[PDB]
């Protein structure tokens, strides 16, 4: 098995371009601040971890670090996911919020 990996909020930013961007599908070693796969400028297209990593409030339960199966809504039309910038899904054929 791949290590169990935990979902958290990033913050983004590509100095070359100067385009930020944040992501609540930051994938961390579990229990820890690191990040295991890259995001992708849209711009220059190179791999690029966050800045500042969160915890995130669950909108199930409203605690972080809980045990609930899901913390945010998929397939969400208001919090799109970049399939095609996010190192983790962007060679599968369904998204990490699919
Ligand atoms: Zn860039
Ligand atoms: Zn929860
Ligand atoms: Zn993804």
Same mark, same amino acid.
């Given at each position: ?5 935990? =979902?958290?909020? %990033? +913050?983004?930013?590509? #100095?070359?371009? /100067? ?6 599908? $930051?994938?961390?070693? =579990?229990?820890? /601040?690191?990040?295991?796969? #890259?995001?992708?400028? @849209?711009?220059?297209?190179?791999? +690029? /971890? *966050? +800045? @500042? ?8 339960? #409203? =605690?972080?670090?809980?045990?609930? *199966? $899901?913390?945010?809504?998929? $397939?969400? *039309? #208001? @919090? *799109?996911?970049? =399939?095609?910038?996010? %190192?983790?899904?962007?060679?599968? @054929? ?5």
């Amino acid at each position: 098995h791949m290590q169990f990996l935990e =979902q958290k909020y %990033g +913050y983004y930013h590509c #100095k070359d371009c /100067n385009i930020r961007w944040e992501s609540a599908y $930051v994938w961390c070693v =579990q229990g820890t /601040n690191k990040v295991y796969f #890259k995001q992708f400028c @849209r711009t220059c297209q190179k791999s +690029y /971890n *966050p +800045y @500042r990593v969160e915890d995130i409030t669950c909108q199930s339960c #409203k =605690q972080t670090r809980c045990s609930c *199966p $899901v913390k945010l809504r998929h $397939v969400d *039309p #208001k @919090r *799109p996911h970049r =399939q095609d910038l996010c %190192g983790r899904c962007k060679g599968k @054929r369904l998204s990490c919020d699919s």
